[PDB]
């Protein structure tokens, strides 16, 4: 429901229109303080009209208009007002909603800025792994599956849009030893280790290994595998290469910083 | 029964035209005042009050602001209800929903009291 | 039984743990959704409630120990109180050194033992490479 | 996978001279030697006699042609139904050329089949849409040419033989 | 759209900018009631006394404060007080071999010039053959310096030429 942001923007716009009206009528209530060469400050008056032209910005709200026109009479809210009149203590529900949203955003910002850790070091479960894999499989166009043909370690494969499927061996976490193979795969009777490529997919595997060694966290493997899955899914397009042309080399793929760009650019 | 979007759509052109009219009458009052003060009397005609113009402008502005704020509040209420409760109303048993809301309120109050005792122990 | 340098190191580790526990309590508060959301009615709810209760009790004990070690460091100012070597930073022990040498020798022996063990482990991994 | 291919019919100097100039430009681009997968273009027809080869050849009768069997099976089917088909007598031409794999991109120069023809430049994609690098290379490779636009980007999964039949359709061009 | 107020403000030529007061402020103070929008006292003297009056232009001061401590600058006979503002009498007191102090008299801080002037060089350079080679190298380097600067560029080039032309 991003229309709330649009309505807040419209409120800010109309408040700015009122403020600009007040400001221009106040400026008209004063003359040239000290010009001594030309009363060019009257041009600021015209500039004030530009702020009044910002009223047309409120007309932009007509594009954001038609945000809500439905039934759903306030979404299951009325309990005491439209219900038991004696049930007056209702608003506690809305208070709790606001409290929870505030706590959520507060803790989110706190965790986001707490990246500057201060802990030096630490000095003085296959079912869980399969469950984490299945939970990560919950994203669209990211059909993954595992079989564990050899060993107690995890053998996971991912196929997003093309025949560029990737295999990643895990040890219940921090899945290292990545191998991407475009257009064949599981030869013999299980996953293979051919690692054949077109001198570019091998580079992609190198990038994946670099990320795995880079996105390795000291604990909490959930966030680790989540960042891993997002980093891999970011390859769904492979069609744009900023900071250079589209043919800087054999192929231009390296989104390590949440944005794809031309390869060989570190 | 008018809608917030409908009232906004019918108020915006009234607001614009009232702004135009008040600015025109303000310019007329200004040129009349200057002609009577700076130069000789030429605008031998009574002007307007000029106060009702911007007064009603600000009135319609306040009306628009508060109705848009009410609409925003309604959307926020719907969003928070959908987030804190599943969409089920006559489907869900109403007394069960009331009990679930009461338990949610009690749980939030307990979390708040725990954090408050934590802060007090920090003191 | 002075253990003063170890006490200062323990205080540093304790404030580091306080910071890490602050990070942890924030990371566990951010994922505290509505009670009757889907299924976490009271089980995981009360579970994390008790978890944060233990968190705050441990943090209070840690603050107690921090106050105690700070008071101990303050009262430790006995003899050579000024000690201006802070701004003047530069620009028997035999028995302890011998015990350290013997410990390092035993550590080198155990290191060779671990080297043999990991060689055998790599060999076993090689065998498994031959597996079907 | 099935990448575009066109034939810029140049003139002025010569056909062989234009071919040599294109080959020199490709070598300057860094075209590595990758053999000569000379792809013929024979006609007997609404079937066809496509002998283009990509280590396997086939003729596309219609519906882009199944032609999923090996070349020996297709030739045996042709010799068996000698006359039982409606496609022996038309002009049997054969185009040739060399194939160079610059870097994960093979380029083939289909020369004059019967002698009157152009030198079709055929490229091969890796995975395949996917015209960003394609166009970036085509503009840096030739001038106002290489339009391509085959029966691609419609989604039946990277069909090469349909493109080959489209290229062989240039017989009536001269 | 409301260009009427614009043409009216254009009309507002006469000096009596007080009719607009009676025209606008009644309703303004009526509907808006901040008679004291800034009751904080505002009384500060703009210019009482602010001047260095005791040194050269501090621009060269802030420049020379950055240079390496191996450069020791002193004060020559008083002929570069304010306008010239610079008598770069420097010694390269460091682990490298010493030499003759440079002159390097730059110009007012506008910098339509540089420092090197080399007055006392005539006898300081031609006497010693090695120092003559040093001077040749320093001149060749300065000529290749596009628009050298007051202290940093000149002294840096001089030091690098002195410790490169050793051979």
Number of strands of chain B: 0
The termini of chain B sit apart by 55 Å
Distance between the termini of chain E: 80 Å
Encode the helix/strand succession of chain B as letters: HHH
Summarize the amount of helix of chain B as a percent range.
over 70%
The portion of residues assigned to helices of chain E is 25-40%
Strand order, sheet with most strands of chain E: 1-2
Count the DSSP helices of chain B: 3
The class by helix and strand makeup of chain B works out as: mainly alpha
Main location (chain B): nucleus
Family (chain B): Belongs to the Mediator complex subunit 29 family.
Protein name (chain B): Mediator of RNA polymerase II transcription subunit 29
Keywords (chain B): Acetylation, Activator, Nucleus, Transcription, Transcription regulation
Describe this structure in words.
This is part of a larger assembly, with chains A (266 residues), B (123 residues), C (132 residues), D (174 residues) and E (167 residues). By secondary structure, chain B is an all-alpha fold. Chain B has helices at 4-37, 51-84, 94-122. Chain B contains three helices and no strands. In chain B, helix 1 packs antiparallel against helix 2. Chain B starts with a helix and ends with a helix. By secondary structure, chain D is of the alpha+beta class. In chain D, strands 1-4-3-2 form a four-stranded antiparallel sheet, with no helix packed on it. Chain D is globular. Chain E has 167 residues and is mainly alpha-helical. Helix content of chain E is 37%, strand content 4%. A two-stranded antiparallel sheet of chain E has the order 1-2. In chain E, helix 5 (129-143) packs across helix 6. The termini of chain E are far apart. Classes of the chains: A alpha+beta (266), B mainly alpha (123), C mainly alpha (132), D alpha+beta (174), E mainly alpha (167). At the A-B interface, helix 1, helix 3 and helix 5 of A face helix 1, helix 2 and helix 3 of B. Chain E: It is found in: Cytoplasm; Nucleus. Chain E: This is Mediator of RNA polymerase II transcription subunit 15.
Summarize the entry for a quick read.
This is part of a larger assembly, with chains A (266 residues), B (123 residues), C (132 residues), D (174 residues) and E (167 residues). With 123 residues, chain B is mainly alpha-helical.
How are the SSEs ordered, and which strands pair?
This is part of a larger assembly, with chains A (266 residues), B (123 residues), C (132 residues), D (174 residues) and E (167 residues).
Chain A: H1 3-28, H2 42-53, H3 55-59, H4 61-64, H5 91-113, H6 126-136, E1 143-146, E2 154-159, E3 166-170, E4 176-180, H7 201-214, H8 221-233
Antiparallel strand pairs in A: 1-2, 2-3, 3-4
Chain C: H1 4-30, H2 43-75, H3 93-129
Helix pairs in contact in C: 1-2
Chain E: H1 4-11, H2 19-31, H3 58-64, E1 72-74, E2 89-91, H4 121-126, H5 129-143, H6 152-164
Antiparallel strand pairs in E: 1-2
